[PDB]
């Protein structure tokens, strides 16, 4: 309402419109190559900027600060796991995907295994995973921040956001979104750094964070309701392992073996096997450019600790009776939610700490985060639908109809997400961040197991790969069923879910589900007849440098030997910086 906020929002919109129009003037959007794969023309800095921007949503500010506030600094685990896994994309997965000449990841499995059915299954499962784990977090986290910072209606505002992100998406092709993601990555990091600075000034620096956070409890621990009573000292006090990434393997809220192995499996699906991330690598200029952009995205994926997690811990220090509330009546008074108020962590700091001009910039940061992420989902889902499912229903389609079907899917998945918004508004507090990471851990590991055996074990065949995936979903729903039948509650109001169902952390069941899906794939593969080498050139890690004539069930990934040496050194130095920081906060 102060004019400076409107001028900052207008400036940010004019940058985004300006770079959109420049990208459409530059690139060709008339063909499937151009509109869906950016012409296979993107150099390193848009690839890095877009990998980062397509990941970092409104969820990352709401969820990481909120969980920061609630549970200390182990949530950085989610971000920092990514650092290691982006190196597996650039060096192992990205080469095979370039030599296969695929537009979608289901199409890679069609080439590797060769039935009709694996491609169809993985397309339809990916569509359900994006409605559940990716749209839901962005719509929800959007809605939190609008209700807290602005107070505007969280239905109509989500419709208006979904509406503008539709137009942003359908107007340009992957080339528009990746150049716009270099503007959005600048604003996201820039404004996030300004708020980090104001926050750290208010607690009295970095020393201030680490000497005030363990004391920072609410003074209201007594309910008016009998059979809640005195809230336990366990569940309003901050956790005594709040300053440690690496927490206890049986009693930790995120056990260290589950963090490292179990997140690597679920991060493997997210970064190496999934249409949304891998489309940025399929539109690279050359493998050297992909590897270079994977290093940039890596250094950026350290930033979220210092920009989201530690700010949310500072909100606990500054507003403990509102951010760290435990009594149901008090929490219902503060932000509407009986189960807690962690979620207001990040958007209290924007309301309280930011002056007249920079409140606008922090609105532009949330907008930048949300639009980049929802557009990347709408484009990647468009590709999945068009290329895998619509080319089934119409085989002799051609590149004019396929772009129209691409554009009409973006309209349809916006309307499905509007229909879905009330189900996601049913999530009460930080239940959604926890459930997203559960769902990911119950459906992703079989896919992680298939793409690793598809890429590294040439004996694995279509019967194995398919019944591996379906056995996977049976095991994954045996837990994704029973739990959600019980509900969630809080530490104050525990759910009645049995210990033998819920006591195993979801990231440990990721490790079990991966090895059981792995073992099933290999067993059924080794029983049934194998696929010979003539079907498999440039589709497997062994044979990415083949030159032999494949029989189907620019493919040229060499490198300026000097520039190879550059990106290889920066991979090892970027892992050294990773490893140091995991040590520092262990």
């Amino acid at each position: 309402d102060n004019p400076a906020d409107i001028l900052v929002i207008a400036a940010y919109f004019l940058l985004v419109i300006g770079v959109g129009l420049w990208s459409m003037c530059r690139t060709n959007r008339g063909t499937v190559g151009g509109y869906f794969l950016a012409g296979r023309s993107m150099v390193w800095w848009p690839v890095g900027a877009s990998l980062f921007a397509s990941n970092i949503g409104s969820g990352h500010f709401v969820g990481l600060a909120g969980t920061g506030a609630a549970s200390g600094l182990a949530v950085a685990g989610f971000e920092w796991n990514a650092l290691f896994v982006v190196l597996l994309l650039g060096w192992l997965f990205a080469p095979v995907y370039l030599t296969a000449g695929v537009i979608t990841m289901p199409q890679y499995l069609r080439k590797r295994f060769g039935g009709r059915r694996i491609r169809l299954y993985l397309s339809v499962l990916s569509l359900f995973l994006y409605i559940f784990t990716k749209i839901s977090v962005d719509m929800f986290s959007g809605a939190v921040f609008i209700q807290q910072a602005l107070g505007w209606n969280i239905y109509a505002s989500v419709i208006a956001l979904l509406g503008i992100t539709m137009i942003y998406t359908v107007t340009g092709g992957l080339a528009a979104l990746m150049y716009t993601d270099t503007v959005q990555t600048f604003v996201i990091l820039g404004g996030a750094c300004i708020l980090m600075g104001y926050a750290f000034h208010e607690v009295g620096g970095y020393s201030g964070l680490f000497d005030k956070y363990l004391g920072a409890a609410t003074s209201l621990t007594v309910s008016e309701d009998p059979a809640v009573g005195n809230i336990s000292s366990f569940c309003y006090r901050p956790r005594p392992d709040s300053y440690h990434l690496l927490r206890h393997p049986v009693t930790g809220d995120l056990p260290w073996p589950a963090l490292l192995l179990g997140l690597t499996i679920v991060s493997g699906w997210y970064w190496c096997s999934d249409q949304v991330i891998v489309q940025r690598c399929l539109a690279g200029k050359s493998l050297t450019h992909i590897k270079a952009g994977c290093i940039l995205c890596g250094y950026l994926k350290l930033t979220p600790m210092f920009l989201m997690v530690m700010p949310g811990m500072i909100s606990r220090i500054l507003y403990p009776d509102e951010v760290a509330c435990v009594v149901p009546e008090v929490c219902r008074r503060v932000c509407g939610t009986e189960v807690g108020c962690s979620n207001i962590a990040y958007p209290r700091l924007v309301v309280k700490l930011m002056p007249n001009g920079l409140r606008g910039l922090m609105l532009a940061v949330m907008l930048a985060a949300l639009m980049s992420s929802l557009a990347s989902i709408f484009n990647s889902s468009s590709t999945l639908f068009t290329m895998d499912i619509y080319t089934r229903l119409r085989p002799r389609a051609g590149d004019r109809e396929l772009l129209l079907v691409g554009r009409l899917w973006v309209v349809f998945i916006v309307v499905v997400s509007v229909a879905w918004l009330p189900v996601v508004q049913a999530a009460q507090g930080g239940q959604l961040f926890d459930y997203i990471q559960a769902v990911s851990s119950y459906l992703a590991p079989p896919v992680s197991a298939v793409f690793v055996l598809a890429l590294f074990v040439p004996r694995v065949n279509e019967q194995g790969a398919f019944w591996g995936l379906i056995g996977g979903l049976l095991m994954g729903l045996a837990r994704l069923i029973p739990e959600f039948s019980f509900g969630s509650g809080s530490c104050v109001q525990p759910s009645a879910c049995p210990a033998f169902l819920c006591g195993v952390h979801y990231l440990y069941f990721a490790i079990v589900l991966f090895f059981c899906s792995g073992l099933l794939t290999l067993t059924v593969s080794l029983c049934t007849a194998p696929i010979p080498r003539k079907h498999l050139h440039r589709l497997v890690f062994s044979l990415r440098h083949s030159k032999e004539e494949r029989e189907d069930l620019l493919e040229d990934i060499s490198e300026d030997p000097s520039w190879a040496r550059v990106v290889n050194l920066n991979a090892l130095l970027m892992m050294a910086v990773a490893v140091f920081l995991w040590g520092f906060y262990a």
Binding site: M575, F580, G583, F584
Partner: peptide, 29 residues
Amino acid sequence: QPWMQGLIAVAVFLVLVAIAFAVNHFWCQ
């Protein structure tokens, strides 16, 4: 001390990457 945990972490990482070169240098060629 946090800084020693950092340096120990790096040290162990550089041992494992030195091993990864060693193994592929002697067992792939």
